Design a protein around this ligand. Structure first.
Ligand code: L75
Lengths: 99, 99
């Protein structure tokens, strides 16, 4: 689909049975989800944004279906006010930026 | 152009006679440039993200070219590492997310 940017680019994602809403963010290198439980072992990582750094748990090779399209990648889970679908999974569903 | 997302989407912007590099960011409501000086008066603006909120100087009706496409609008200035072009100026140059 072609998404305009007048409102925040939110889409529905299916992740671990849960359907959550999320933001298609071209400014984000990583994908960051709000506090939830994912199976598997995790690493800790520190990632920084607009305020400063937060601590997240890094889960690798996790499956998200972003807007009807499946994608596999690294998902960081922790204290974000919104779920961010970053560039590592956007490439996978074939997302581009056009003008 | 048709910009894909394997690398960070940086572009040359030109503001105040000088060329700078900025990230194209669909998850950023507003444009925020690095600490520079701009004409006229500013107002206070609190922006939040990952890691909380920060305070930036709001300037209005500032001309900025992104890829030789001119935009006149609101640019916030504050303590950021990378200049960010947010939705407010990406809708002006007619930018969409496609997939
Ligand atoms: C992997 C992740 C997500 C940690 N990356 C980022 O946060 C990067 C950081 N860089 C590197 C970065 C470090 C840094 C340090 C100080 C200050 C800025 C900084 O940018 C700058 C660009 N951001 C990406 C942003 O697009 C993220 C976005 C997330 C969001 C969206 C909506 C609500 C809350 C959080 C974001 O922070 N956008 C905010 C946003 C951004 C610009 C203008 C207004 C606003 C409001 C809101 O849209």
């Amino acid at each position: 689909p072609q998404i305009t940017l007048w409102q925040r680019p939110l889409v529905t994602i299916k992740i671990g049975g849960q359907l959550k809403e999320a933001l298609l963010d071209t400014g984000a290198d990583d994908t960051v989800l709000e506090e939830m439980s994912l199976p598997g072992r995790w690493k800790p990582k520190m990632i920084g944004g607009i305020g400063g750094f937060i601590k997240v748990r890094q889960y690798d090779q996790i499956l998200i279906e972003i807007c009807g399209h499946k994608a596999i990648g690294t998902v960081l889970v922790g204290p974000t006010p919104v779920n961010i679908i970053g560039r590592n999974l956007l490439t996978q569903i074939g997302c581009t930026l056009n003008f």
